[PDB]
């Protein structure tokens, strides 16, 4: 309500990630803006520690579902905006089939007039010549459905979805996502009926930018309840 009101216009975003995969440490900073009226996010990420040791598409999901567009009839099911400005904790395990896994913990909250996603990522059991550390992912992204259920026992939501990563040999590498979101503030909140976020992502580059980087555009609309 008051939380939803914070998203009526364009909101600045900052993202910060500290990461360690198979011992390779790295850091990413991002900035951009979100317009939840349209379900639209635009971000730019720079690896501030040099070369990113994993492919950029593997971090798209880690890099703010409060910017989803919830249609009018579904607005009572938007956990993410209600929890603002105090925010929520998002945790994932991401299993790359026949490879290693990411574990992430993020806090998503407002710092001033800015929505901030601060993340820590640890990745283990990857193959040094597999698709991830070997950089065999196409620089692109497909559409997915993010399935959300209430987790009443934990005052939050649990989320599951499977990302399809296109590989340079024409194959597809599946990344199973297991996600939980818990409010940062205390007190029981209203939790949604089962629904999903229709998510579309487009990755691009700034051709003058010489640092290792990703430009990410996202379009996210909630769906899956009767109209």
């Amino acid at each position, epitope marked *: 309500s008051k939380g939803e009101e914070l998203f009526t216009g364009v909101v600045p975003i900052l993202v910060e990630l500290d990461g360690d995969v198979n011992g390779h440490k790295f850091s990413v900073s991002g900035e951009g803006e979100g317009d939840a009226t349209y379900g639209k996010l635009t971000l730019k990420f720079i690896c501030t520690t040099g070369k990113l040791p994993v492919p950029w598409p593997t971090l798209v999901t880690t890099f703010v579902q409060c910017f989803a567009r919830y249609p009018d009839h579904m607005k009572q099911h938007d956990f993410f905006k209600s929890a603002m400005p105090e925010g929520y904790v998002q945790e994932r395990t991401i299993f790359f089939k026949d490879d290693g896994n990411y574990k992430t913990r993020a806090e998503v909250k407002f710092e001033g007039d800015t929505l901030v996603n601060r993340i820590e990522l640890k990745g283990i059991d990857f193959k040094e010549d597999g698709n991830i550390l070997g950089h065999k992912l196409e620089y692109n992204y497909n559409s997915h*459905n993010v*399935y959300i*259920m209430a987790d009443k026992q934990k005052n939050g939501i649990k989320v*599951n979805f499977k990302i399809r990563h296109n590989i340079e040999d024409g194959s597809v590498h599946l990344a199973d996502h297991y996600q939980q979101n818990t409010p940062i503030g205390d007190g029981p909140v209203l939790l949604p*009926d*089962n*629904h*999903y976020l229709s998510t579309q992502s487009a990755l691009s580059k700034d051709p003058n930018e010489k640092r290792d980087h990703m430009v990410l555009l996202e379009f996210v609309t909630a*769906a*899956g*309840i*009767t*109209h």
Partner: nanobody, 124 residues
Framework: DVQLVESGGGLVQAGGSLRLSCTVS????????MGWFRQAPGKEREFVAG????????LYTDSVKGRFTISRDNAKNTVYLQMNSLKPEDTALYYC?????????????????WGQGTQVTVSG
């Protein structure tokens, strides 16, 4: 809480096909894992097919594998059971069932809610 109404049943010749429907009224359809069961006179209800709330995970009893398809339309409160290559042994009263989903999977049992059923008769 929720009410289930089956339809699409009838008589068809062995090798024919039928599409059953189950319409869910009341609470939010996407909250429920959905299943189809079938019963021959005097025998028990046996599980036929089950679908997760998301539609992404399905289960089938062996004897219908590759002939029946369960699917759902979460915006239309309906689950369907496409039954192809029907055999006389498929003759039965077909029940729709529902259960508040605990996770993202389908389930074979422990359904709380039941329709009255739609008759399917496969002539031999």
């Amino acid at each position: 809480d929720v009410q289930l109404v089956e339809s699409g049943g009838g008589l068809v010749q062995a090798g024919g096909s039928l599409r059953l429907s189950c319409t869910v009224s009341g609470r939010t359809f996407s909250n429920y894992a959905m299943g189809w069961f079938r019963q021959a006179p005097g025998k028990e209800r046996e599980f036929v097919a089950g679908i997760s709330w998301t539609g992404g995970h399905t289960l089938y009893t062996d004897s219908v594998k590759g002939r029946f398809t369960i699917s759902r339309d979460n915006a239309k409160n309906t689950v369907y059971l496409q039954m192809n290559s029907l055999k006389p042994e498929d003759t039965a009263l077909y029940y729709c069932a529902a259960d508040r989903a605990a996770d993202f999977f389908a389930q074979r049992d422990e359904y709380d809610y039941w329709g009255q059923g739609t008759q399917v008769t496969v002539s031999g």
